Structure 1
């Protein structure tokens, strides 16, 4: 389970937000049915997450539909 890359624009304006993803699992480890529930702030991390849930991979043959993650992007602080 890899981690989503911090969006440039954000990585630049020292800003942050959280993202609620809901998705499925294709019978082989991969993923499918990519969806974005809530994501404050708006257009900023979306695409960044979708692209990160691309190389994901775990248990082949034991899929499941409808599973939420919810990920938050953060900046050092100092």
Structure 2
């Protein structure tokens, strides 16, 4: 019948000491979008620079909310993958 439909998915906030000393990088993160609409079982696959951005990516994802997957007649979980790039403008 359907898939994941995002409802709240506000983005994460650049770390304070990252803008200062313009740093930049990325997080790749594997996760689950529970039948219950919420994010779960977050696994980080890439982190450049290591474990720097993770904690905001996690805290942002907390708040996220979705219409869950429908698979003909029972609502189902969904495994997903997403990439965050952090950047500095000018």
- Greater strand content: 2
Q: Deviations for 1:12-46, whole angstroms, at most 9, x for unmatched residues?
A: 11110011000001212111001100111112101
Match of 1:46 in 2: 54
Normalized against structure 1, the TM-score is what? Answer: 0.87
Q: TM-score, normalised by structure 2?
A: 0.77
State the distance in 2 between where 1:62 and 1:6 align.
33
Q: How many residues align?
A: 76
4+ residue segments displaced more than 3 Å: none
Where does the alignment leave 5 or more consecutive residues of structure 1 unmatched?
A: none
Partner of 2:84: 71
Specify the structure having the higher radius of gyration (Cα). 2
RMSD: 1.2
